[PDB]
Enzyme design. Structure first.
Site, PDB file in Angstrom:
ATOM      1  N   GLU A 234      -4.852  -3.076 -24.674  1.00  0.00           N
ATOM      2  CA  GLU A 234      -4.719  -3.436 -25.869  1.00  0.00           C
ATOM      3  C   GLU A 234      -6.015  -4.350 -25.741  1.00  0.00           C
ATOM      4  OE1 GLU A 234      -1.587  -1.354 -27.659  1.00  0.00           O
ATOM      5  OE2 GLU A 234      -2.867  -3.332 -28.672  1.00  0.00           O
ATOM      6  N   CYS A 268      -6.131  -9.877 -32.675  1.00  0.00           N
ATOM      7  CA  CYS A 268      -6.499  -8.404 -32.549  1.00  0.00           C
ATOM      8  C   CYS A 268      -6.718  -7.575 -33.266  1.00  0.00           C
ATOM      9  CB  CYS A 268      -5.824  -8.077 -30.917  1.00  0.00           C
ATOM     10  SG  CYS A 268      -4.503  -7.212 -31.535  1.00  0.00           S
TER      11      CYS A 268
END
Lengths: 466, 466
Positions: A234, A268
């Site tokens: 990720e 993110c």
């Protein structure tokens, strides 16, 4: 006995200290995890669910330690810390709910009498490397479903919030997991390469999940390839939010403001690029500028403002460099601006172009760029003009058009008329391109932390050609 | 214009020739695949199914060219070539059957009015690298489900059977796929690194599937990690077959003989190690030796024997070395023996120990070693004393005990009372450890060649905290 420290960004005094583990000490943690795996891996689904439910309650019982640790270590507001604790506890309860849902498939065979199974089994030791920005949520994400899948775990704690991550493991320690099932590794920043390398090389470590930058993600993937270890990566994001000609401009401005500045843009999936078609660009920009100007920054200890502090001076300087590069290249600051402290303003840069560092580089700070698109086709091309592809959003009153646009956007996640910042434990979450591969959440998450095995049983004699 | 050739192992004359493509020519193939993707990716499931059904019929229509090519290039029997054709055609029809089964999931959301989808979408260009041992099966496996998933494909053909692999692409060319959807890359062995490297580095190539050795798989995984590309790695192994004290010894001997010597033991899942408990070792060995002695080797062009030729002299020298070594260390030769030609005997060595090369080595030739276990617990330890973990088998009349043993064996596949050699298109197939990761077949195969995306649509206004 060697420790490292984390300095409090609001006071410049020590927030916390933790053991600076060596590669040898990290290998001994993996040996304890390897020994704890066998017992934990054969526990039934309701027994596993009951331990995970105790872990969620023990996490909620350390609330005061978690709020103090996050505020001191990363400069978070008490609100961001309580939000972290609440959602982290909900994700542990979702992992506990999944234990009776982790099974297999029976597949019909052309071999007469052959019973054929595709079983999802525990793998072994899972290494979970968690970042600092939503530290309880992401520290828990690194280990909850891996534990629900019958694996022993190693939480590789962030050097930015070692106490916040240490408290997750102390909460899980009160739940009654067998010895060696839940473990922590802490290290000084300069030892990250050798400590993480030693854990990736360890034969008991069978799955690696990592959340962090693309650069570190590529180093981890290359090190994992040397021992053929699968990874869940990720990585970075430069989330675009597309505003088409029939978008509800009030709703787009509110979703863009929430997505750009939540946790000071340290997510993110924070909104980094707002791509607006020329037909509505002036009106959207006016509404969005007014909204960003109404969002104040203040001391997180006072708890009176929507924005608190950024994690440290490195972010302040990086954001200031992005502003100087942008304005030197013709862009205009229409909200906020440069700052001299971790209490940064919600900044909006208009007229962002492909020549500017802000068009491509991940800021991880409270700054967003507005890019002008000619029409829908140009907005899709601009949304896709990035090596990243984590989250994206499209605003349009014609939701069927939103689906046609979402299908063309290259990303792992796309929200039609929703902000780029959104996550739920039951949804698959991950990127494409430089944002990595693999998915946390739902059934995809289960597949990342189980071994799929083809098991067959004959009930008749075989008929062999030779 | 530069070509490489493949020499016929039975005649030592040229079997075939193919273009020795450069890295630049391989990149131009990926550019054509990238351009063909958009059109193919939006075709409906019944239209995609109809094209794939035409490909299966066109494959079967080129039967004479396939039988000639396999016999000449790898020294196969006409039977092994017809078997390859039959099963490869069945796998294309299974991929055609899956088009209406590749969908997504609707997941309930805690955000009011939010419709949340988890969609499996086409990825782009899939690179499929296929080996020579079961060339039609594996060449087709590298591309069939990738094509059903709506991707464009590049079959990276084996330098050992370039005509057999070239004929797969010529068969698919007759089916009516759009331009640039099905492509081939051929290269001289010495250019493998640069040609495969250039394709892995190409931005349009989004998934890589590789079947071959562990050494080359590790090189492919590291090269893929540099551009964060996911891989499906099927890296062979050293398949153990365990015979427990209550095994049906006649059935175990028949399954072990079929698994050890089918295609002269040149299969990723060929039986390499037979682990026998002391209680039945003498009787099993007698039955198995009598069975191996009844399996003759003969010229594959005559079509009168169960065994044909090995792929080349390298295998002959390697198997001879394993015999010399084992017998010099106290092993017993109970069937077959050393050969001076590619027509090798079905060879069985008994009393194999960890001091011998035959205990860990992948032989990829018609030789199997019998290892003596004290009891069930020792047999499990011996089965697991390998870095590999692809296929395995356990023989026992107590199938519940077979399940307990299969659960302890570390492998991607385990057959209770079945041979180690077994594959069906609807079953998930892959390894663990040095045998790689990822799975071909069934739903697992679909997941390898699609992009899982979280797509949402709001039906109510959002409620933002800031």
């Amino acid at each position: 006995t060697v420790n490292f420290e984390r300095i409090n960004p609001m006071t410049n005094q020590t927030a916390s200290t933790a053991k600076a583990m060596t590669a040898a000490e990290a290998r001994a943690v993996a040996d304890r995890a390897a020994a704890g795996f066998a017992g934990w891996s054969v526990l039934g689904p309701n027994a596993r669910r009951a331990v995970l439910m105790k872990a969620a309650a023990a996490l909620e019982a350390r609330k005061d330690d978690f709020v103090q640790a996050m505020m001191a270590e990363i400069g978070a507001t008490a609100g961001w810390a309580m939000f972290n604790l609440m959602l982290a506890a909900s994700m542990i309860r979702e992992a506990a709910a999944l234990t009776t849902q982790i099974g297999g498939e029976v597949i019909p065979s052309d071999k007469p009498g052959c019973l054929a199974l595709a079983l999802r089994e525990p793998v072994g030791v899972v290494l979970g490397i968690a970042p600092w920005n939503a530290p309880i949520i992401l520290g828990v994400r690194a280990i909850a479903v891996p534990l629900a899948c019958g694996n022993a775990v190693i939480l590789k704690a962030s050097e930015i919030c070692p106490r916040t991550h240490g408290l997750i493991i102390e909460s899980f320690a009160e739940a009654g997991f067998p010895e060696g099932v839940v473990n922590v590794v802490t290290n000084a920043p300069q030892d990250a390469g050798e400590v993480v390398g030693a854990l990736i090389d360890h034969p008991a470590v069978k799955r690696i999940n990592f959340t962090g930058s693309t650069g570190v993600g590529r180093i981890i993937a290359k090190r994992a390839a040397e021992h053929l270890k699968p990874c869940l990566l990720e990585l970075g994001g430069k989330a675009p939010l597309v505003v088409l000609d029939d978008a509800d401009l009030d709703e787009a401005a509110k979703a863009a403001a929430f997505g750009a500045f939540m946790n000071q843009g340290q997510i993110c999936m924070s909104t980094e690029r707002i791509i607006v078609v020329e037909a509505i660009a002036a009106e959207f920009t006016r509404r969005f500028a007014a909204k960003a100007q109404s969002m104040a920054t203040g001391d997180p200890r006072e708890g009176k403002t929507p924005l608190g502090a950024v994690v440290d001076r490195k972010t302040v300087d990086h954001v200031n460099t992005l502003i100087d590069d942008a304005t030197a290249k013709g862009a205009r600051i229409i909200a906020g601006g440069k700052g001299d402290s971790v209490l940064m303003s919600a900044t909006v840069v208009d007229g962002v172009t492909a020549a500017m560092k802000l068009y491509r580089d991940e800021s991880f700070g409270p700054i967003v760029g507005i890019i002008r698109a000619k029409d829908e086709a140009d907005a899709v091309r601009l949304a896709n003009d990035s090596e990243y592809g984590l989250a994206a959003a499209v605003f349009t009153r014609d939701t069927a058009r939103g689906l046609r646009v979402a299908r063309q956007i290259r990303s792992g996640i796309c929200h039609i008329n929703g902000p780029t910042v959104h996550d739920e434990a039951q949804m698959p979450f991950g990127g494409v391109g430089a944002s990595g591969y693999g998915r946390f959440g739902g059934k995809a998450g289960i597949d990342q932390f189980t071994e799929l095995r083809w098991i067959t049983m004959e009930t008749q004699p075989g008929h062999f050609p030779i």
